[PDB]
């Protein structure tokens, strides 16, 4: 079967090989699978093609196909520009530049289209914070990660908003705008749920936050854009389902 059949089984005599069935029925039938659907036929079938059938030769598509290939995992691993946040001279120590939930912040139409059809997924996540200050500007940011933000005790979330000291104890990386151009933090998937529920959205596994560690310091008022790029890694997909990836 050149019908790219995943498996095929003529079941005509199957009833004749059951131990507790005697003189079993001989019933012309065949079962075959194509990906997630199995066809169980209860009579003969005919499988036809073009005379001398040959699939389209691979060389024909070089004019348009990418030499690189792209699967669902590949799409989820693509860097995405997640946002551009304002940082200015008036922001003081610990001012929040941004706080982005995971996955949430990466659930663009590109990612949603590819996750559609799965119950869930889990992944490590890499965040880049980029700042382009000119040489006469100084300042410092902290990019940190906190787990299961929507179910963490309030005292903990408050501590993060009260004092940057509680952000520095978290897994984090620091950005000195006069020395580094970009800084990255990779966080593995950690949660009571083995994968993130795309159907009920019950519970984002982490949040990445960026707070001012030392204010943007310039001779006159100024502001800079703090940009975020992110992508998933160590991706694990769920199970095929008709459930909608919730908005």
């Amino acid at each position: 079967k050149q019908m790219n059949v995943n498996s095929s089984q003529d079941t005509t005599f199957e009833q004749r090989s059951q131990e507790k069935v005697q003189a079993g029925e001989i019933n012309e039938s065949i079962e075959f699978r194509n990906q997630i659907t199995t066809f169980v036929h209860d009579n003969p079938i005919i499988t036809e093609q073009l005379i001398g059938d040959s699939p389209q030769p691979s060389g024909d598509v070089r004019s348009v196909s990418d030499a690189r290939t792209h699967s669902i995992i590949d799409f989820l691993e693509r860097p995405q520009f997640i946002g551009s946040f304002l940082w200015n001279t008036s922001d003081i120590e610990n001012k929040e530049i941004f706080s982005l939930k995971l996955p949430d912040a990466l659930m663009s139409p590109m990612i949603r289209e590819k996750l559609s059809g799965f119950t869930s997924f889990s992944a490590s996540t890499v965040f880049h914070i980029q700042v382009n200050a000119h040489p006469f500007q100084c300042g410092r940011l902290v990019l940190a990660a906190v787990p299961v933000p929507d179910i963490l005790p309030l005292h903990r979330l408050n501590m993060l908003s009260f004092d940057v000291s509680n952000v520095i104890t978290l897994p984090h990386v620091q950005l000195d705008i006069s020395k580094e151009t970009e800084v990255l933090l990779k966080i593995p998937y950690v949660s009571p749920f083995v994968q993130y529920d795309l159907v009920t959205k019950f519970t984002p596994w982490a949040a990445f936050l960026a707070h001012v560690y030392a204010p943007l310091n310039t001779p006159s008022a100024a502001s800079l854009q703090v940009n975020v790029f992110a992508h998933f890694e160590d991706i694990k997909l769920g199970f095929p389902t008709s459930a909608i990836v919730a908005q």
Binding site: P147, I151, R156, S165, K179
Partner: protein, 264 residues
């Protein structure tokens, strides 16, 4: 290794993992190299992990019910209020599941946990005629994961342990993890609707019954318990300052300790 650098070098993980090794101000690493003589001569032991400390039991809550439903895996700590206003008590604590213990105080630094716990019970009265205490695994799906006087009269065939307040004096229990997941959340939120089926904590509570009008409950980690994902210092106040009375009102804060419990 070099005292200074152009750009960040002291990175959180690199230092803890031993890849970044700061130089001693004296230039001789021997000055901050471990010396075992002090602990051997002065202390008599050497603690290396909070894993050891949480296995020590501490008091958590005082009950005035003879039969109680208690939220075993709830690790929340009290709400606190402060004031320096005249004639008002300086500090006030309002518990939900109980007061802080080594288990919940160390736990407040982390996001997750897994493994079992242990329970200890001191009786207010060891009643000779009715000396037994029963601690039963409580699993009703309907019950909220909160403290409540027992009103159930239909929870047959439960897992029960019996201890005797007269022949022994203190009840000792071990609770299995019995979780639907492999990673639980420290002080997960408990809700009205919730019941006892949330995946964030083992779906198991205690039903404690005795003929003592009051009991003092305490706990600790079992041998397979662990905390994971360090967050940092939890919101906290000075324990010693709870004796403050500078407002003119006498301090009224009182933690559940054996002496507070046993004597009035």
């Amino acid at each position: 290794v070099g005292f200074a650098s152009a750009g960040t070098r002291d990175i959180r993980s690199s230092y803890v993992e031993g890849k970044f090794i700061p130089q001693d101000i004296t230039g001789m690493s021997r000055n901050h190299e471990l010396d075992e003589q002090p602990s051997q001569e002065c202390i008599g032991e050497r603690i290396l992990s909070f894993s050891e400390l949480i296995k020590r039991n501490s008091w958590r809550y005082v009950s005035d019910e003879k039969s109680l439903i208690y939220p075993a895996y709830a690790f929340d700590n009290p709400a606190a209020m402060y004031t320096a206003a005249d004639k008002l008590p300086v500090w006030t604590l309002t518990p939900r599941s109980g007061f802080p213990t080594l288990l919940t105080s160390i736990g407040a630094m982390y996001a997750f946990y897994r493994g079992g716990i242990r329970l200890k019970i001191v009786p207010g009265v060891a009643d000779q005629p009715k000396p037994l205490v029963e601690v039963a695994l409580f699993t009703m799906q309907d019950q909220g994961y909160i403290i409540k006087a027992n009103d159930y009269s239909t929870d047959f065939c439960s897992s029960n342990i019996y201890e005797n307040f007269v022949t022994k004096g203190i009840a000792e229990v071990q609770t299995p993890y019995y979780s639907r997941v492999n990673t639980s959340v420290v002080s997960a939120p408990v809700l009205y609707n919730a019941g006892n089926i949330s995946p964030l904590m083992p779906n198991v509570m205690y039903k404690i019954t005795s003929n003592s009008s009051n009991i003092l409950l305490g706990h600790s980690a079992a041998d397979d318990f662990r905390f994971g994902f360090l967050l940092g210092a939890p919101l906290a106040i000075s324990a010693t300052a709870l004796r403050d009375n500078f407002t003119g009102s006498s301090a009224t804060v009182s933690l559940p300790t054996f002496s507070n419990f046993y004597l009035s």
